[PDB]
RNA sequence: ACGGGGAAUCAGGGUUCGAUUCCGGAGAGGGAGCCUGAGAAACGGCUACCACAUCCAAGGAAGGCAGCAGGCGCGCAAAUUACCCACUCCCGACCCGGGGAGGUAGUGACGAAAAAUAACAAUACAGGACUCUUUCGAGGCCCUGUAAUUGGAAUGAGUCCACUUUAAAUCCUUUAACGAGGAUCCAUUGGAGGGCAAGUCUGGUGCCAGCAGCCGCGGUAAUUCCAGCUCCAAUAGCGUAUAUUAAAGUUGCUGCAGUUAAAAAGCUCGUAGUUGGAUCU
């Protein structure tokens, strides 16, 4: 059972702050090595230069070639395989382009079709891919 | 309606004393010199560099 | 491997232009339309299989 | 440091469940009964009544002879009688919890133009008030979301500069007279 | 990790943030040492050292924006070399001078408040309720739609005198004149298998291209892709990424569990810690 005294306050809280390190969420946040291993450094977005365009074959229960882009970030020099979302949008991307890279939505976990990709793409050379896919703006040079 | 403020002096000599000097210019009873703040504050720092005689020469 | 199929199904569609049509209403008159549309007039219905976008 | 004041509320709360037919249908009836613009104008009155009821909850928890309940409660019971929501016979703090949303929207100016027969539709009234044809005793009111006080009701009229009250016509009747 | 006042979130308990306009602290590139003064270890004062860096006739001399502007760099991430001492106050010998303190404009979809994008009437029908009628049908009693049908009524957005505003302006308010019939004064962001509101529509593609937070969809009728039409959710906003809170009674003090689902030390002793029977009007 639980110690249910009155002078038992530090037995409770020194136990709580040890059994809270066995939470997976808490230990990921507060230990701060996930934060160190994250290439964004806890940032929402980043900004990098394309090194090449890499097709990524999808995971087993279905089949496709998910079109991805091997970027290298500027602020720390990490390298990333970021995912270009829509169809024909890989044509919008040359090598050596400024790419605003965001996260995907599962915060370090890949989204189910794609093996090991955390990172979608928002802008290419300061114009957004939604503007290029819908023709509202055009690729500059 | 319109609501405003108003003050009635006893003599115009008092009104030339007890009034803020933009409300004398609104009746043509005052003239401001036409130099902007950047004009004299440039001049103040130039004449700050001169000794006693020629500080009046800098304009 | 091969990246050559990128905008295959995008470019292979026949480009249809959107139809010229009158403008919708906005503001509360759009909300005026829906209240009349849903809660004022009654269609005599016994099974309730008529969805709002029910193509049969 | 500046001389500004940074205080501001938010006057609505988005609901917990986005899509449910029992709630979307029940909001949209009140839009259509009372001519509201969007769902935020429903989520606003529902939020003010969520505060009036929550303040009256903590007064009911206190002692019945607690002076904080006797003073602050007799103010809240007073402030609802003046905007015509509770009544004189029902001015007890138990009855504040017996209030509904459309108890309040009967007292919006948009509806009180219509109920008085000035406008010929609940939608025609939101026109007129924003069209600056409505005055409260001397004051052209340009907002439909205007809670008419109980003494402030029996005289609301046609804003003497208007074509309806004092009768100088607008652009249209002038230009039609410039032809014949 | 500057600390509080505080903020977000909450049934109750709680969790998280507080670089940031109020109070206290600290530092003016990093250290150190001083002169003056009532008050400084002052940096819009000095002296050195270290690191940067300016001018030059090469001998020398002059620095310190984490002040207001503005620039470079850095980044996901942040504004004008504007005007004024008129307000608020401060300083000085001082009713009189000065103050990038501060105020006023500019940039400003951080965020918050109010709030347009239509309204009414008559006909064309379709309707559908109340009434008469065995039904038929009739109604002047209502309501709804489609009317690129008619109809003049009311308008702001905008252009713009003047007044007001103000230090001088601007904005707002106030008022002349002009300014509304639908491809114009044209509302867009997401979606339509489920969760989750709303198509078993049409055309194309045919494990491709793609969608999809999750489950899944896609291999010739694809309700899930790419398009058209439709309709639905919010609405001057609405998507996405990330941190965080509730959901989480999945951190449990309230309030969790430990036979078999993750889990009780092999066994006892034992100091600290925790808890301790009555009984004293």
Curated annotation (Swiss-Prot), chain A:
Where it sits in the cell: the answer is: Cytoplasm, Cytosol; Cytoplasm; Rough endoplasmic reticulum; Nucleus, Nucleolus
Q: Which CDD domains match?
A: Ribosomal_S23 (cd03367)
Instruction: Give the Basic residues compositional bias ranges.
Output: 1-19
Pinpoint the Glycyl lysine isopeptide (Lys-Gly) (interchain with G-Cter in SUMO2) cross-link. 36
Does the record carry Mitochondrion as a key word? no
Name one process (GO BP) from the record.
stress granule assembly
Database matches in SUPFAM superfamilies: Nucleic acid-binding proteins
Quick one: where is this thing mainly located?
cytoplasm
Q: Which UniProt keywords apply?
A: Acetylation, Cytoplasm, Deafness, Disease variant, Dwarfism, Endoplasmic reticulum, Hydroxylation, Isopeptide bond, Nucleus, Ribonucleoprotein, Ribosomal protein, Ubl conjugation
Q: Which residues carry this modification: N6-succinyllysine?
A: 53
Sorted alphabetically, which InterPro entries does this protein's record hold? NA-bd_OB-fold (IPR012340), Ribosomal_uS12 (IPR006032), Ribosomal_uS12_euk/arc (IPR005680)
What PTM annotation applies here? Hydroxylation at Pro-61 affects translation termination efficiency.
Q: Which positions bear 3-hydroxyproline?
A: 61
Q: Which domain of life is it from?
A: Eukaryota
**GO terms, molecular function:** RNA binding; structural constituent of ribosome
Task performed by this protein:
Component of the ribosome, a large ribonucleoprotein complex responsible for the synthesis of proteins in the cell. The small ribosomal subunit (SSU) binds messenger RNAs (mRNAs) and translates the encoded message by selecting cognate aminoacyl-transfer RNA (tRNA) molecules. The large subunit (LSU) contains the ribosomal catalytic site termed the peptidyl transferase center (PTC), which catalyzes the formation of peptide bonds, thereby polymerizing the amino acids delivered by tRNAs into a polypeptide chain.
- Give the protein name, as stated in the record: Small ribosomal subunit protein uS12
From Swiss-Prot, chain B:
What tissues express this gene product? Mature tissues, such as adult brain, skeletal muscle, heart, and kidney, express low levels, whereas tissues and organs with significant populations of proliferating cells, such as fetal brain, placenta, bone marrow, and various glandular organs, contain significantly higher levels.
**Cysteines engaged in disulfide bonds, as pairs:** none
Top-level taxon of origin: Eukaryota
Q: Where is this region: Disordered?
A: 25-59
Q: Subunit info?
A: Component of the small ribosomal subunit. Part of the small subunit (SSU) processome, composed of more than 70 proteins and the RNA chaperone small nucleolar RNA (snoRNA) U3.
Family of this protein: Belongs to the eukaryotic ribosomal protein eS24 family.
Name of the protein described by the UniProt record: Small ribosomal subunit protein eS24
Please name the gene that encodes this protein. Answer: RPS24
From Swiss-Prot, chain C:
Where is this chain's protein located in or outside the cell? Cytoplasm; Nucleus
Task: Output compositional bias ranges, type Basic residues.
Answer: 20-33
Provide the disulphide bond pattern: none
Which residues are annotated as modified residue N6-succinyllysine in the UniProt record? 48
Query: Which portions of the sequence form the region Disordered?
Result: 7-33
Which domain of life, per UniProt? Answer: Eukaryota
**What job does this protein perform?**
Component of the 40S subunit of the ribosome. Contributes to the assembly and function of 40S ribosomal subunits.
Assembly with partners or alone: Component of the 40S subunit of the ribosome.
List the protein's name: Small ribosomal subunit protein eS30
* Annotated organism of origin: Homo sapiens
What range of the parent protein does this fragment cover?
78 to 133 of 133
From Swiss-Prot, chain D:
Is Phosphoprotein one of the keywords?
yes
Compartment list = Cytoplasm; Nucleus, Nucleolus
- Residue ranges occupied by any S4 RNA-binding domain in the UniProt entry: 107-180
- List keywords of the entry alphabetically: Acetylation, Cytoplasm, Isopeptide bond, Nucleus, Phosphoprotein, Ribonucleoprotein, Ribosomal protein, RNA-binding, rRNA-binding, Ubl conjugation
Question: Which parts of the sequence carry N6-acetyllysine?
Answer: 65, 115, 154
Question: What SMART domains does this protein map onto?
Answer: Ribosomal_S4 (SM01390), S4 (SM00363)
Fetch the Gene3D superfamilies from UniProt.
RNA-binding S4 domain
Q: Where is this cross-link: Glycyl lysine isopeptide (Lys-Gly) (interchain with G-Cter in SUMO2)?
A: 92, 138
Which intervals of the chain are annotated as region Disordered? 161-180
The protein's matches in PROSITE patterns, at most eight in alphabetical order, are given as:
RIBOSOMAL_S4, S4
Q: Name one GO molecular function term.
A: rRNA binding
Question: What InterPro entries does the annotation carry?
Answer: Ribosomal_uS4, Ribosomal_uS4_CS, Ribosomal_uS4_euk/arc, Ribosomal_uS4_N, S4_RNA-bd, S4_RNA-bd_sf
Q: Which GO terms describe its cellular component?
A: cytoplasm; cytosol; cytosolic ribosome; cytosolic small ribosomal subunit; extracellular exosome; focal adhesion; membrane; nucleolus
Q: Which GO terms describe its biological process?
A: cytoplasmic translation; positive regulation of cell population proliferation; ribosomal small subunit biogenesis; translation
The PTM Phosphoserine maps to: 152, 162
What function does the entry list?
Component of the small ribosomal subunit. The ribosome is a large ribonucleoprotein complex responsible for the synthesis of proteins in the cell. Part of the small subunit (SSU) processome, first precursor of the small eukaryotic ribosomal subunit. During the assembly of the SSU processome in the nucleolus, many ribosome biogenesis factors, an RNA chaperone and ribosomal proteins associate with the nascent pre-rRNA and work in concert to generate RNA folding, modifications, rearrangements and cleavage as well as targeted degradation of pre-ribosomal RNA by the RNA exosome.
Q: Which gene encodes it?
A: RPS9
